[PDB]
Design a protein around this ligand. Sequence first.
Ligand code: HEM
Length: 152
Amino acid sequence: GLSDGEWQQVLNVWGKVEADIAGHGQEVLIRLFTGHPETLEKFDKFKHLKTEAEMKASEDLKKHGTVVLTALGGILKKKGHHEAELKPLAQSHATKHKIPIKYLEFISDAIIHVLHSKHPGDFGADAQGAMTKALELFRNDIAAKYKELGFQ
Ligand code: HEM
């Protein structure tokens, strides 16, 4: 549950991501995959990547990074009013992709990490607080749908 001041910060930060959505998306996925290699096994089309150089060189990985952050951005722009947008993602990730909620925690922290990395000294404490709350909201609403589906 975010205040409008916090949403303002979220969307301000997101402006950074949108100036280079593919670059941000790429680095987020790389941080996830290298930080938590088990997550790589959920992707039949990336499981072949064994090194980070191969990851960095992968145009399809960058492409999926764009798809992921485009979807997240559409969701963030709803400022919490994202039931329509979130439900199919929850459903596809629970039932088709079988992504445990832990992995959504992983990618949440990865976004935080990447923002600091690409914007050192430009991602203030207030901005981190707001972004973290937004990602928690996202995760928590997915988690509710996971529970409905009995998905672990
Ligand atoms: C911010 C969090 C995430 C967002 C916004 C997101 C969004 C999406 C979207 C829009 C798609 C394509 C449409 C669909 O299949 O529903 C997708 C596919 C997929 N996602 Fe997610 N995702 C997120 C997190 C994750 C995580 C953490 C994992 C695994 C650790 C994951 C695994 C997958 C897989 C395996 C596919 C299918 C890829 C393919 O074969 O093309 N997702 N995701």
